[model samples]
Target: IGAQDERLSTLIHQRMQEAKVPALSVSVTIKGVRQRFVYGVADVASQKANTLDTVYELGAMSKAFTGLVVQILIQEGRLRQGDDIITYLPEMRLNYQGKPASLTVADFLYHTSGLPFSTLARLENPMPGSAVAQQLRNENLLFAPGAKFSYASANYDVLGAVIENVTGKTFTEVIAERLTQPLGMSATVAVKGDEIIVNKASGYKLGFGKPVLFHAPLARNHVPAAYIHSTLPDMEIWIDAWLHRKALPATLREAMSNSWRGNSDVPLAADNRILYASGWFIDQNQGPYISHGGQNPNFSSCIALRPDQQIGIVALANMNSNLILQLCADIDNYLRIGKYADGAGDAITATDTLFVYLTLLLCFWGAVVVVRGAFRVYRATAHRLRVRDYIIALAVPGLVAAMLYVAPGIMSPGLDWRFILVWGPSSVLAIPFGMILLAFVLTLNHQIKRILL
Candidate 1:
């Protein structure tokens, strides 16, 4: 146990440093003996070290609880797994390639409903889960249901409405009654609206490749899919329940098993070795474990469990990054095989990498242009502006600004501009806005200098 602790601590520290994670709280259970590890600071500003009580947003991992709720309903004969979703959501009309499609509850749980990831990208106003689900009628389905796996939070958003409709309770209330209350998970809560969460770890996102404090708006409608806050000890119990079915009630045990069973053979688009189950992914290469990860603007988390081996791992971090997934995998490997795996390649996404390079280049170009403008103004050059100068001065900046405004739409149709600015890397807006500001300022300075001369 001592050797295991040292090795695991070293592995976690290395990965945390690589990802620039401000704080991470992890829970690991081996053969029914649970252990906890906390590192770094929960509040980076205060340098408050993370503890077992530090609450962190679970992001998409909240879907597992949503899926479990639906399964519970199914087990009680209140809902059917294969029933057409439109049956519960009578106001919604979904289609694929211009034809009517009947997506089942199972379809949504397994992320096989053909809903695009951008389906909820344009939601500007806060609304109920039912309204969010109803809005899907306006979205175009990518393909027929059950044809393939396309993970989308909108699918679970619809399920949240179904649970409410059937139970006459809000999703959060249902979660409390059905899961948290029964399992004795006191720190886990389905977050609602802009309410302050006690002891919740501050979330951070990458700004110029550095952690920037981000307090994400907890959209109430997304609660069922991505707005859960839990602590390390609570997450350990959550994972342990999955690891040992006997720990849950008979009904919930069956529902959990049903949720864990993979509904299809289709692999995920990003990782072919995994297939989507109800709310978890069945990883074929990694001990065939059930795994899921979550990322809100500020916080990220991951959970992996191998039921047969009675091994469960949960990682909660204050940074919005994918490194949590790699951390979970490495820890699992070390626990099972006495060795840690290599780090996952490429710390940043290709899009983020491109944005970083563009931001750096723009910073350099902005500096040069600003210096030239200063020189021109200082020399009192009496140079009159030409037609081409007017075009460059006014038209170019105008065009670039327009492009930047519409770039979100071009890159992802229906994506909200604010969404891009918040969730996307700071460099995304920095590069384009930097170009516009530089051009406009330089041109205006040149024109003002002519007047003074």
Candidate 2:
């Protein structure tokens, strides 16, 4: 066991170094006892070597924590996964087919809710919890409840609101009382301010010569989505609690299990491995394992636990690197297969690959249309010909119509044609119609002006 641990440690360190990661903190556990190791420097210029105590942002990995809070409320008879959201937030309104709509809490948590990935316009105003409630009065549902699944940060924001409504405490307070305190995670806290007093690692990105620091204040907006920060030691305790099912009740644990199948036609990694339940992703990799990953511009994190095997692993890094998955796969393979396999690629489903390719093609074609229209307009004006001007004006409408057809195909893939009738068709047809109307109005005004002259 000691030899295998040593080999795994060496392998992880070597991979981090090869990826040019400045700081790497990892924790491995077997039978509830955790062994943690830190490698490389936390700050390359300051020459500060990373320790097990160094704090890093948890990012979307915080969703599992939010899920636990929901499970706790369910166990207390305060809430249920299937409860209607309108029962709690009666004032909440969703827009559907140019009409008012509503959604349930179950719809929100399960990702079947019709909410968009975000309300960029609403969030632009940056409302507090109360104002957010008011904003929902005018917000629109992107689709009908239980119609489809899309990974959304707004779902958790609504979950956080529900937590507050049930407990009469803020979401942060609920988390501290139910999950963080019970698990004895002192270093873990939701991100809120610029200067955290904890031994927090600064985030960085790869640049031309040196890594550029990412100290954007927008990082604070990650609350309820990707905001919690914790040290390796603290996360170890979290893993242990989850593996043993000690902090939350057994029934809640089952609900939190990644057993609920996704409804979307879009393929996700978890869809094949297990289903997304509560917060953590559950599946079996030669054994039952619960896993989650976190990402933002600055940091990447991953946590995975094998319950039946009594093994868990946490990988946290200060620098953003694409190889984080490769590192995790290596660790998981070593633990399960007794040796690391070469070139073990992630399983990409046909549906997912097609979605990606189609999305890219749509983006590329849309860009081409925009660029071509710009060039035509510029050349027509430069030539000083009235005929060229009229041709350019007429062609602009056609370009917009072509874009309208192509944009929806890019926005949604693997969807039934009926979906286009509901939301997709209007969006696809709007641009062309608007452009044609504009062109007609322009031509009439120009002709009128010429006749008067």
Candidate 3:
């Protein structure tokens, strides 16, 4: 503990305040010295404070474990990276519009598979199939498989399916037998059956005008995409095991190690760009580090390792937010520059304050315009205004309404307008103002023509 510890705590407090995160568990390992930090209440309703060992769901971070399992099998010659995915599920036949279903297992691991954005499509967006398995299998390819990176969760689902079928075991069972048991991660599990693992933090979508503070539904399925949970202490052990390549056979560890190293076709082509290597996003662009983050509507987590600097940061939050990504950047700065970075204080989760302010401004200005127009009708008793003047009067509110309606579309594709309630409830708050403005504008159109023409 030096200037470093104080600066880190300051940044965490500010960033979590902006993000409105209810609870967080962070583990920072520098030069093999692992330390843990906890902040805020794990369950807002229960008012239980967070502890260093609080369990939280690992969103996309689950990919790191799944990808590691695939590579371990490759080292054992049980599976090959180059084997066609069709080989694993031979009973199934999948084809893309422009190509055959010939993507390699590495393709899924690397996210080079041209599957749709799996997180959105699988969960929030309608699944392509009635069941989770069908949704992934019959999910249409956005392009030929392996053309470029599209970051699909469905590919991992496919990988999970392949692993389950080939190994003849549940995802939970395989992970327990292969990874967790070897490392003695008592708190880690793929998670099923309400057997009640103690100390698991309650997950939530913190606040965006959400009434009653909604909680994430924890249900276990064969769908192996984004369904791993662990505590900060367990993750500390996992990160240490990964950093040192401990608790595994040398050959298998070497295979896992190869994921962070690069000299392949993709890295060579995307030399300066961010490359998805195995389950991690290789940021040669950031000078050198391997990191991955995870989330859904509720829990979130991220892990970043700067091997050269001997810095590792792992953060998990019960609120569905991405403050962990920003945490990594600031921590990296601290490790490299010997001072905490700026801008950690500027994270507003769930609510977009700028939008809220703008909505209020529009409401005021709109009401003013309508009131002033009625005054003009009272004062101006000469010739009526031209049609164009009334047109201008009505057009202002019309344009404002149009922008408000289209605003959330850019937030997500095919997202329901109900999402306005979930992500930015301020838009819902602006609804009464919008209605008044529209009604006032339409009502004043004739008066403007009669008074000012």
Candidate 4:
């Protein structure tokens, strides 16, 4: 035990030093007994070191709590694990292939339903919870239900809605009653702005010299997806509940275990080996380990448990950077190896990955072109081109080019030539229709300006 503690402390300190992390709060448990170690400062300016009790945003780790509540509802005979979600939240209508759609609660929890990672687009208008449900009614499912895995937060948000509808209680209230109250997690809360607000760590974004506060409005729609906040010690209680099967029934425990079927060859570390089980992640690397990590603009965190080894670790940091993985790996190695073995050195940066680099570069170039075009428009008078003249010069050629280049590719169907044989001339009609609409809009705008003058 002494060796394990020293190794863990040394490795955590080394990682904190390497990452230049200002503060860290950690907890480890073995055989249901837990130890917490707090180091560095929670707030750099104030020089307040993080305590074991300091609360940090649990991020997606909150999903486990939601999963637990779902199981409780099932055990009570209030709901079934296999029940269709549409039965509970009748407003959640999904359109697939021009047909209305439905999904089961199991599909959403296991991520087998093909929902997108988020439904940010749908919430752009910012509606209340009821209005959000109404909006979900009209949206289309990206893929067939229960077809494949898609890492989606929208799924859980929908589940939260279902939970609320069936129980006649808010998601937060149900979570508090079923999980937090029984588990004695007084510091834990489902919503961000509720009471028990003291010791809350501010979230950060990477800025020029130091981390800056992330000021986006707290997500009102994705409540079940990402709004959970809890302290490291509180998480230790949750781990104990799961590891010991004390807070939930044996049947619910079996249901949670049943959700682990592994993932595809997605090449992501979290995806390649770990299986999504209920709300937690089951890693199949060396043994059956349960874990999950979280990411947002201002904070990051990770929690893992080795049930066979009777070991669990939780790492929380205030910075919203990608270094949480390295910290976690170091902690794991230390506990397993009994010494800081230098394990693997120099973790991979986000820029080091080819996919991330290309995506960022594409966005960079696209922005540059947009800015250049805007500048040219601003300086049109100096270049002796009126806004009207520039519009005419660009619009006519742009329309002609669109017809010649873009239209053919879209209208000309596949290599088998079946679409051409079937649709044929009808497909080409869209191009002329688009051109006529563009011309009509331009002519109307010109007539309106002349009349105003």
Highest lDDT model number: 1
Give the per-residue Cα lDDT of candidate 2 at 298.
Answer: 63
Instruction: Write one digit per residue (lDDT tens) for candidate 1, span 1-453.
Output: 443487788888888887788998887888977777799889888887788888888888988999999999999999998898878888778878787788888888888888777765633236555476566775678877887877787678888889988999888899999999999999899876878877888888777668878777676777788787888888888887787677678899899888878865554465365667778988766566888888776778888888778889899999876778667888888888889766675334445678888877777877887787778666765354566556657876887788888877888776768777667765676777778877786676666556552
Off by over 4 Å in 3: 1-4, 90-95, 98-100, 123-133, 193-197, 206-212, 217-223, 261-263, 267-271, 284-288, 344-351, 354-453
| Error at 275, model 1, angstroms | 3.0
Scored against the true structure, residue 227 in model 4 reaches a CA lDDT of 65
lDDT of 4 at 221: 53
- Tens digit of lDDT per residue, candidate 3, span 242-305? 7777656797588778666532444334344677866787776446788887865566677898
Computed on alpha carbons, the lDDT of every model, listed in order, comes to 0.79, 0.64, 0.68, 0.63
Clashing pairs in 2: 85-104, 85-105, 95-140, 95-141
Ranking by lDDT: 1, 3, 2, 4
Tens-digit lDDT track of model 2 for 212-282:
56553332334666667788988887877766665566754654453333333324564363556666665
Clash number for model 2? 4
User: Whose TM-score is greatest here?
Assistant: 1
Span of 10 residues, lowest total lDDT, candidate 1? 121-130
Error of 3 at 243 (Å): 1.8
Comparing 1 with 3 on TM-score, the higher-scoring candidate is 1
Model 2 earns a TM-score of 0.67
The clash numbers for all candidates, in the given order, read 0, 4, 5, 1
Q: Select the stronger candidate by TM-score from 2 and 4.
A: 4
